[PDB]
Amino acid sequence: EFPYYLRSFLVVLKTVLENEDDMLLFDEQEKGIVTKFYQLSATGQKLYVRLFQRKLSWIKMTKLEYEEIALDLTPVIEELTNAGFLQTESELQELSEVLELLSAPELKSLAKTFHLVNPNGQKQQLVDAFLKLARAKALAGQSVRICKGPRAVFSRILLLFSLTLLVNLGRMEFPSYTINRKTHIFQDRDDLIRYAAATHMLSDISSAMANGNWEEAKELAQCAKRDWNRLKNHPSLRCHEDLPLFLRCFTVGWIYTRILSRFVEILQRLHMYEEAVRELESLLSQRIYCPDSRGRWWDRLALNLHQHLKRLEPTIKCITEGLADPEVRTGHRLSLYQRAVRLRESPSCKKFKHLFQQLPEMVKHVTITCSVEELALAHYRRSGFDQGIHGEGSTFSTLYGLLLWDIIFMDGIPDVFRNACQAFPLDLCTDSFFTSRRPALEARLQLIHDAPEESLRAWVAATWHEQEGRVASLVSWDRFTSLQQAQDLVSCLGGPVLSGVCRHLAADFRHCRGGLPALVVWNSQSRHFKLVEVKGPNDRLSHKQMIWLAELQKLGAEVEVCHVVA
Amino acid sequence: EFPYYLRSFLVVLKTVLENEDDMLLFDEQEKGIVTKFYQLSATGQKLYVRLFQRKLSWIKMTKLEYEEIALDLTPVIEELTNAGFLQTESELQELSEVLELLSAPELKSLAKTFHLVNPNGQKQQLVDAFLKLAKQKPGIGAVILKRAKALAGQSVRICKGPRAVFSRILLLFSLTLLVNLGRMEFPSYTINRKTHIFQDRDDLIRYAAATHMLSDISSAMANGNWEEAKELAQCAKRDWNRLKNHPSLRCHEDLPLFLRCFTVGWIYTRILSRFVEILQRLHMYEEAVRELESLLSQRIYCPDSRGRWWDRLALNLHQHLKRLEPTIKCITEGLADPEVRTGHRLSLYQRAVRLRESPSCKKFKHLFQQLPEMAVQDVKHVTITGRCSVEELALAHYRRSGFDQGIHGEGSTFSTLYGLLLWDIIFMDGIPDVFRNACQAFPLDLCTDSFFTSRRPALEARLQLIHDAPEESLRAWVAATWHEQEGRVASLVSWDRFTSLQQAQDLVSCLGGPVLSGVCRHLAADFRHCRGGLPALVVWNSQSRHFKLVEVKGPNDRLSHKQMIWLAELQKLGAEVEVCHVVA
DNA sequence: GTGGCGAGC
DNA sequence: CGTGGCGAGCGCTCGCCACG
DNA sequence: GCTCGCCACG
Ligand SMILES: [Sm+3]
Ligand SMILES: [Sm+3]
Incomplete structure (x- = not known):
């Protein structure tokens, strides 16, 4: 029906x-x-x-x-x-619309009609020949x-x-x-209309970049860029500025900001490093939209100043600003750092030592010879670790979801739930998630760190029983083979490690998710486990991955990097 | 575009x-x-x-x-x-290849990363250190390799x-x-x-590999890498031996000499010849004599080098080896070889007297009857005070001595005239296999005995016509060739050597026809040995057209034997000669 | 028997 | 987001004939 | 004649 x-x-x-x-x-x-x-x-x-x-x-x-x-x-x-x-x-009444509706033989036929020199040329060539030349409807139907x-x-x-x-x-x-x-x-009808048009433009630009159409992408971005200023004095942005971050992301200004951010990638892909620098400076000159992107900006900017433009002094200044800014996450922070040393230790910068004075004081490898993860798993099967999971970030994030469900979904936080079809509260990927849920978070995470094994097992079972199958973005209901496997894993990880992981995820999902090792293996009897990152030929540790190997090691979890050789 | x-x-x-x-x-x-x-x-x-x-x-x-x-x-x-x-x-994927690619700062960075000692250390030491570090089946090398690639880009x-x-x-x-x-x-x-x-694909491949090896050996010696040059030379030596009894080599022995130089065997022979110099440097004089005996035991490849070979062998037997009797034998056999040039020949005789007059070999006198009676002359030597190029100082002196003109052109002067006088024979049709492609600067047989023997009728007629030619004839023929070939690339002819056609005509007029005929005959008959002995300088008084051929020698620079032979030849044909010594 | 190439689908 | 229909693009094979 | 890139469909 x-x-x-x-x-x-x-x-x-x-x-x-x-x-x-x-x-x-x-x-x-x-x-x-x-x-x-x-x-x-x-x-x-x-x-x-x-x-x-x-x-x-x-x-x-x-x-x-x-x-x-x-x-x-x-x-x-x-x-x-x-x-x-x-x-x-x-x-x-549009010529191109009719031309493109016709399949190949018809266009060929029509080409024969007008005494086009070639009727058997490529479709696009005929399309172009017709357009220059400018009944197709008479034959179409x-x-x-x-x-x-x-x-x-x-x-x-x-x-x-x-x-x-x-x-x-x-x-x-x-x-x-x-x-x-x-x-x-x-703010109003027209505000929605401008919002939607920005959306479509961003979608065009994204499409272009994906297909490598960088020159068209730059034109489209340049038009967007023009249309922006000529708005970005408009009244509505006012009330947009008054919106909280997690709602501000759904405003016209935020969208065009994202557009400008892709413009950076465009300029660089085209080796137009200068123009790129200007856009970076522009983005960093305002703090209204996309605070989350500040870290990315400084990090790219330093690279642009340091290695292609090679104008070293303002590069130093940039890096120092970068470290000085509050919104930089750990990954970009470390990247900026390594760049700071790097400039600090070349005869080129023997003199400018005196501008490096603010500076902060900011892993186990092995090798073995279809699937690199499965090969690793086979080896640890030999090494006594009868269980193992290849699930990357979702494994741990799933544990987070299972341990903190009722807090993630707690009542009393205005505007994070706006309709009944959300997978997560809207403030999830912002620091205000944690600041807004601090008392329940702090007390329950302390409750986790000290919790006995079976308590963890019991809470996991509770959530599993009450929630299995429904869509929660944090939880992959198929990541584990069974509740029992999950219980065995939480038993091996123990309370303090779990506490540490849940802390990271709650503080910063966007980057915790991206940092987690591919693998986790364990012996179901001894509860001895290892967290393993796997790298085949041409696969390298990212900065994020290095930070999280250290963090997990700090929690007492044993970590290892397994390289598969060709 | x-x-x-x-x-x-x-x-x-x-x-x-x-x-x-x-x-x-x-x-x-x-x-x-x-x-x-x-x-x-x-x-x-x-x-x-x-x-x-x-x-x-x-x-x-x-x-x-x-x-x-x-x-x-x-x-x-x-x-x-x-x-x-x-x-x-x-x-x-090769660790060494990437370690070789890296700049100095990058290698320094990587070195600090793995806590390598002496980080301000030299590139190559760091490279070697990384490779050792890698050698901690299988190895920690692959991971280092990744990271070096990462920084390289x-x-x-x-x-x-x-x-x-x-x-x-x-x-x-x-x-x-x-x-x-x-x-x-x-x-x-x-x-x-x-x-x-x-003969087939692999013969070309063998040929090419010999070429590359010779290239390496030459390069090695030039850089003073005598140890590697010797190892490379020994590998090549086995590689020539391990080629023995190949079919295609018979085919190489069937073709004429001037193309024989385009075979694997000729190239390895050249390699063996440099091998002599290599072993000498490293004092393996024993191996030296033996290798030379080996070269001279065949007359198939590089016969042109026999004069170098005999003369060096004599020297090796004569001195440090101090094995005097076989030295005598060597010199005598050397002179008995007919293909030896006059320069080394003169050198070899000079050594015969030279040993005869050190009491060491008075007993062996019964072996000293081979002696020619051609004794060593001294023509006109003069000296000037130096302060600049030695040639230019000489030129300045002759301008003071009334020779208002002067050219520092060495052999290329006369060779250029040779080229103008016999061009159409140099490039004549009817001699099979001397012209193989559209990009030759010279006929392939040019430096080979068959050049003259293959063109004897036209050559004999043209050299006879030159010997008797009056001034007017010479100048006219030179102009003809100049006009009909001006711009074309001829290996004999340097189109920058002369000031103009007119100067060239003036020079042929001053030196004269019989002399020209004599010189062209010698260089036509035996280019690689005639071309090399000609004096650096040539000056003339443009009034009388009296000219001198002058060789210039600064302190510690001496006449070579070929130069001495050609001064004698030139004086004999009536041309006047002079030797100018510059003092520091 | 072989190569080198041009026409079919 | 992952997979299937499906059009567009494009290669392939084979076969001819000159020739050692 | 085939495989590959593109757009409907649960
Ligand atoms: Sm350039
Ligand atoms: Sm249907």
């Missing part, structure tokens, strides 16, 4: 619609649009959804087959057209397109629902918590 | 491709590779050639600069890599096999290759090819 995709689509609509303040962010014609959607037949809405999920290109009705809708879709198509949501081939603007309305609706959600989700269950809305994230 | 080096490389490769029978000496996969090169983009080929002349090591990608090829080399690198011609830093290396293929192709192009090849213009002649020099 009622297909899943439409159910999901209708859930999102209901959630946004019943909440009146967000509903105030749409004009009358737009509400009229949603009304029109509601007036569609079911077959119409189902077709509309199936089409709406595709990026908008013209599609021949002979491309259309949907048993789940109708064995002949035409009356559905008529309905959607009459409603003003679909358009037919009679509205084809019946076609349909999703109408632009109404899809942009639904686009913004969907955007609003979850700004950052699998297909199974309509079947899937999220954790329970309570809704807490108090602050308005978008 | 289409750069010179690619023009040049394409000429060499095409010239080779156009001859099918030489092409039969390569297998399919190698030709396939060259096909693929030909199919590459222009930027691709440009890059390969620019990398090709750069020597075989890994090279850091941040050092490569080629604006004229590509502002971004990434996709070109990609093309050459996919095509199997280059490799990237991803393929660097993106790097490329020219692939070994394909480079070797192009290597052999260039080798074969010029059995006789600086930049100017694309633009330089050769004399005309017609190709006359009848011989296959290489």
Whole structure:
């Protein structure tokens, strides 16, 4: 009767619609649009959804087959057209749209028609020949397109629902918590519109970089960059500046900041180091958006000053600022440090020793000969360690989730739960997570450090029993083979080590997750364990990984680096 | 747009491709590779050639600069890599190769990292220290290797096999290759090819390996690495021995000498000859004499070097070895060899007297009857006070002595005139196998006895015509050759030696025809020995046209025997000679 | 028998 | 996010004929 | 004729 995709689509609509303040962010014609959607037949809405999920290109009705809708879709198509949501081939007025709708033989045929010198050239060459040259509709036949603007309305609706959600989700269950809305994230309708346009631009730029289209990426970023200033004096940014960090990330300014940050990577990829420096200086000159990115900025900036521009003195100043700033995490900190020594110890910098005066005072390797992790596991199977897990960060993060579930999801923290479809509270990757949950955190982590083995086992079982299967981003319900395996592991790790790991994850998930060794192996009898990082040929320890090997070693956990040789 | 080096490389490769029978000496996969090169983009080929002349090591990608090829080399690198011609830093797995690639600061950094002793230490000591540190089946070396690669960065290396293929192709192009090849213009002649020099692919390969070894040995000796030069030489010695009884070697012995120099055996013979000098340096004089005996036991390779060989053997028997009787025997056998040049011959006789007059060998007098009666003259020697180049001081003195003109041109002066007088015979048609390709500066038999014997009728007629030629004839013929070949590259002729055609005509007028005929005869008959003895300087009074050939010798610089022989020859033909000594 | 190449699909 | 349909791109083989 | 990159679908 009622297909899943439409159910999901209708859930999102209901959630946004019943909440009146967000509903105030749409004009009358737009509400009229949603009304029109509601007036569609079911077959119409189902077709509309199936089409709406595709990026908008013209599609021949002979491309259309949907048993789940109708064995002949035409009356559905008529309905959607009459409603003003679909358009037919009679509205084809863009040359490129028609050119690209035609398959290969047709374009070849048409090429033969006009006495094009070559009819058998590449498609793109014919496309270009036609464009220079500038009935294709006469030969094409019946076609349909999703109408632009109404899809942009639904686009913004969907955007609003979850700004950052699998297909199974309509079947899937999220954790329970309570809704807490108090602050308005978008100042007005137009603010939402500017937000959405920034989003799409960032998505274009990202796409470009992924495909190596760096020159186009730079143009698109340069346009974005222009459009920004000419806004970044606008009123709404005001109330955006008043939003907490974990909500501020969903503002127009934050998005364009991210855009500028990719611009840095673009400039560097193109070896335009100078321009890059300016963007870095610019980003570091404000502290309003993306504090989390400050560490990345200084770290890249120093490298730009130190090794390609080679203007050493302001490089020194940069590094010193870098270490001096509060928001730098440990990884970038250490990287900056090693660079500080590096500049400090070359005859090139024999003189400028006097500018290095603020300076702070800031592992076991082995080798063996398809899967490098599985080879390691086989070896430790020989070494008496009958259990082992290749799960990287999710293993430990999963333990974190199992030990601190009720705190991660505790009531009383405004705006971290905004709807019933979140995998985690919104402040998770910010320091304010910990500062906002300090009393429960501090007392329970102390409770962990001193807890006897079986207590850990008991708490793990409790969470496992009460929570298994539901989506929590911290927990991979398939990382462990069984509750028992997890109980055996917590028994081997013991209370202080667990305490240490949970501390790191709670203080800083974004970087703890990225720091954890691939492997963990243990003997189920003796509870002797080793935490092993695995490196094949051309695989190297990152700075983050080195920091966490040290940290785990400090907690008394035994760590090892296993290199597989070709 | 289409750069010179690619023009040049394409000429060499095409010239080779156009001859099918030489092409039969390569297998399919190698030709396939060259096909693929030909199919590459222009930027691709440009890059390969620019990398090709750069020597075989890994090279850091941040050092490569080629604006004229590509502002971004990434996709070109990609093309050459996919095509199997280059490799990237991803393929660097030898610890030593990466340790060799690293700059000084980087190696210093790495050294401090592993708490290596003497970190301000020298590069090479740190390299050796790392390799020992690695030797802590299997080893801790691989991990060190990773980290050295990490600091080194993106790097490329020219692939070994394909480079070797192009290597052999260039080798074969010029059995006789600086930049100017694309633009330089050769004399005309017609190709006359009848011989296959290489029996098959592996014979060429053996040939090439001998070449590279000789190259190494020469390089080693030059750097004073006598120990490594000796090991390399001994390896080569076995490598020549372990080639014994090869079929193709018989075929090498069948072809004429002037092409025999283009065989593996000739090259190893040259290697053995330097081997003599090597062992002498290291005082292995025993091995020396033996090796020399070995060289002289055959007359198949480098007969031209026999004069050097006999003379050095005599010396070795004569002195430190102090084995006097066989020394006498050696000198006598030496003189009995007919192919020995006059210079060393004079040297050898001089040694016969020299031993005869130290009481040590008075008893052995019965062995002293071989004596020629040709005793040693002294012509006109003079001295000047030095302060500058010795030649230039001499020139200044002769201008004070009324010789307003002067040229410091050594042999190339007369050789140039030789070239002007006999050009069309030097390049004449009808002599098979002296011209093999379009890029020769000289006929292949030029420095070989068959040059003269193969062109005797035309030569005898032309030297007779020169001996009798009046001034006007000489000047006219010189102008003819000058005009018809001006600009063309002739190995005899230096187109910068003379001030102008007119000066050259004035010089032939001053020295005169009979002398010219005499000189051309000697150098035509025996170039490698005539060309070498000619005086550094030549001055003349432009009024009387009286000229002098002057050899200049600063303190501690002495007449060589060939120079002394040619002063005597020149005086005999009536030319006047003088020797100028500069005092410090 | 072999190579080298050009045309099919 | 991982996998399948599926179009676009592209290589391949084989076969001819000159020739030792 | 094949494999590979791209876009629907749970
Ligand atoms: Sm279907
Ligand atoms: Sm340059």
